[PDB]
């Protein structure tokens, strides 16, 4: 695997979005990964509807603004046979009745792959697949008010993950102990962190659980 990967450099990643006051992180992490795989497949980068997932993927186990899972979202897209564009079904930060329209479907997937729960397995996936949906422990004020640099929270849990985000690459901080990081796309707007991104400690014992719930859709 390469020592450094950053899929934003190759056009795989839409601009940072903002979930607002809705527990819909799972939907944004899911659209992020599917946007990456659809771009690899077609060469077209098209923003996808988190609202479609919020309103319609209840049968697969998601709960709208009361949470969900990226794998459930990938299953909905497979079950449903498509997912609408962001443009045609824009984000509302509240759940309403399902309004999926196949006429505006711009994506599909055939399932998903759950990655083994090891950071080096996550590294290979990021290097060979593209952006990867992951779960992290985001429940600390150090993370809420994160500004820049490599985030490391000694109290972070590797099993109490609560926030779905997107790993778009990894790297190392030039000038050899605790220098590696994951490049993570968050869904809290472009003002949060580093243009919406956070560098999360890598190879420091699965910090904040980043490798415990990693997955991507198959297209
Ligand atoms: C994520 C979120 O929006 O928090 C940022 C404020 C949601 O809380 C959420 O869906 N969390 C989720 C696990 C993530 C995807 C790692 C969860 O708790 N799922 C179980 C709840 C059930 C509705 C599936």
Author numbering: 1 to 175, 177 to 220
Question: What did the paper state?
Answer:
Host proteases, TMPRSS2 and CTSL/CTSB cleave the SARS-CoV-2 spike to play a crucial role in the two alternative pathways of viral entry and are characterized as promising pharmacological targets. The crystal structures of TMPRSS2 and CTSL/CTSB in complex with the potent inhibitors were determined to reveal their specific mode of interaction.
Significantly, E64d has been used as a clinical drug to treat Alzheimer’s disease. To explore the inhibition mechanism of K777 and E64d, we determined the crystal structures of these compounds bound to human CTSL and CTSB. In the structure of CTSL in complex with E64d, E64d is covalently linked to the γS atom of Cys25. In addition, this inhibitor fills the S1-S3 subsites, forming five hydrogen bonds with the side chain of Gln19 and the backbone amide of Cys25, Asp162, and Gly68. Instead of occupying in the S2 subsite of CTSL, the isobutyl moiety inserts into the S3 subsite of CTSB, leaving methylbutyl moiety in the S2 subsite, resulting in a twisted gesture of E64d. This might be explained by the narrower S2 subsite to accommodate the smaller isobutyl group since Asp160, Met161, Asp162, and Ala214 form a continuous steric hindrance barrier in the CTSL to prevent S2 subsite extension. K777 and E64d, as endocytosis-mediated entrance pathway inhibitors, could effectively reduce the infectivity of the SARS-CoV-2 Omicron BA.2 variant in Calu-3 cells with an EC50 value of 14.0 nM (Selectivity index (SI) = 7,829, SI is calculated as the ratio of CC50 value against EC50 value, a common measurement for comparing cytotoxicity and antiviral potency of compounds) and 239.8 nM (SI > 4,000).
